[PDB]
Design an enzyme around this catalytic site. Sequence first.
Site, mmCIF file in Angstrom:
data_model
loop_
_atom_site.group_PDB
_atom_site.id
_atom_site.type_symbol
_atom_site.label_atom_id
_atom_site.label_comp_id
_atom_site.label_asym_id
_atom_site.label_seq_id
_atom_site.Cartn_x
_atom_site.Cartn_y
_atom_site.Cartn_z
ATOM 1 N N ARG A 96 -0.774 0.612 -1.431
ATOM 2 C CA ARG A 96 0.099 -0.526 -1.212
ATOM 3 C C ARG A 96 1.544 -0.056 -1.257
ATOM 4 N NH1 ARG A 96 1.421 -5.444 -5.363
ATOM 5 N NH2 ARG A 96 2.432 -6.847 -3.826
ATOM 6 N N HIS A 97 2.376 -0.740 -0.496
ATOM 7 C CA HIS A 97 3.814 -0.511 -0.542
ATOM 8 C C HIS A 97 4.370 -0.732 -1.963
ATOM 9 C CE1 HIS A 97 4.413 -4.825 -0.916
ATOM 10 N NE2 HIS A 97 3.561 -4.993 0.087
ATOM 11 N N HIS A 131 -0.782 -2.642 2.780
ATOM 12 C CA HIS A 131 -0.627 -3.815 1.940
ATOM 13 C C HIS A 131 -1.734 -3.879 0.908
ATOM 14 C CE1 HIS A 131 2.216 -5.381 5.003
ATOM 15 N NE2 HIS A 131 1.416 -4.725 5.821
#
Lengths: 256, 261
Positions: free
Chosen positions: B7-8, B193
């Site tokens: 995930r970012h 994400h």
Amino acid sequence: RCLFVCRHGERMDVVFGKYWLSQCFDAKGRYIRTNLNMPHSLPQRSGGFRDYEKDAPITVFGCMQARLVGEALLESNTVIDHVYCSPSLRCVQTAHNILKGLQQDNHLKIRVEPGLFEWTKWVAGSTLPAWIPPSELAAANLSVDTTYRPHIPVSKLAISESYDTYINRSFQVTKEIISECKSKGNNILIVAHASSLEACTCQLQGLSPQNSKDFVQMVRKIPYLGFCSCEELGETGIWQLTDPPILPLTHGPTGG
Amino acid sequence: RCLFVCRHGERMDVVFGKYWLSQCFDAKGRYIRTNLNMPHSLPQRSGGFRDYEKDAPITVFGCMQARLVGEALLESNTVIDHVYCSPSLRCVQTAHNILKGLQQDNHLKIRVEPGLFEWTKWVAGSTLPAWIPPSELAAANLSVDTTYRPHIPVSKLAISESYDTYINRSFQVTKEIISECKSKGNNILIVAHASSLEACTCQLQGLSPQNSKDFVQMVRKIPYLGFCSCEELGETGIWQLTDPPILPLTHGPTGGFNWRE
């Protein structure tokens, strides 16, 4: 002319809990990190690593909080002439990291002042933490002044001291700091605890202190690396709060 | 060999809220940061700062989260051969900062893949974010491959797509990524994400997708930079989740009062 007081950064024993030593020290006492927010290594302490339990280090991100504050001071052209910290390892490490940010880690030497330790009522346990002495701190590559003469030596602090005793020693110690720095530089930095921001400055501004109840509530307002500034009004020994020379720092948790 | 999905990093619009643009851009569109967790500067965008509205950058701490992950990969001697990311600015910046930690920000070029964008039901309005195109990313100091031909171009993403459509395209794009990298490397990193961790790997492993209600509950549990790993069993095309090659990363907030006086 200015006094800057700030709280230490993020604690290993808060992020990883009271039993954090269980998640980074094995049965042989080897340090083996289990999270990227733990330092790559911890300094060897003279009483052994069990001394970490009442005196835990800052995390990797606590180091970063501190460094960003030092960088902000640098970018604002705020010169720090004198730096003091509480003997708690988390404060010493926060101060050292602020100095790194400031590019002053090879020049300023941190004065460890046991009189800057927080209210000893909050010592989680029977006895005071086994603080790493300044000589050993300097040996662990923390930029500490080994020759500094403390206003309140470690042996003069009392466990479970009263609120009034705590407040009294904060103001007296701060006044002694201000006095000894007087002829020798303009700006003083104190790296200590959330309670320090209230206790070190309350009577310095000529305000009346609050009961321990109002006090505890005010202390809960201070974020990690929470940073305040005072300016001396003429003489008076009355200092007035000023807008800080740097921006505030706010981030959330890794969360999820 | 291995597929890593993460995930970012921490988002500007989470910490500073929806109206962060109002905080840091003045009427002339000059960026003036108001907090040490805001970057020193932000990329210029094609439509002006309002293009940030639906496509927020990561914070200073987000950059560090990503850097530490890249540093950890380096320390585990995990060689990344190909790196893909969602076209979201937060994903691009995350991947760039991972490459920095990895000391590969001069060697690896990131493949921006709109197929890795999250469930389009989570975009407000009837229009997709105004993603910065790969040419302009490479220009804005982000290490992207301008040569890369996406599996699902922007035009092929549907507005408000169904849950099973999101899950299918995640499965399909991941197989396509795996297939194109087979001759050329061993390890692939996908930076996208929270939803991507399960969406990209569930059917790959032949596991059944959760209903969309359970899925959303699972998704909110994934931390910034949350990192999972699948491994392939020889040349079988059989994938299984494995212990990641790096440690997790956990930290807290600044705490105290968010606002004073």
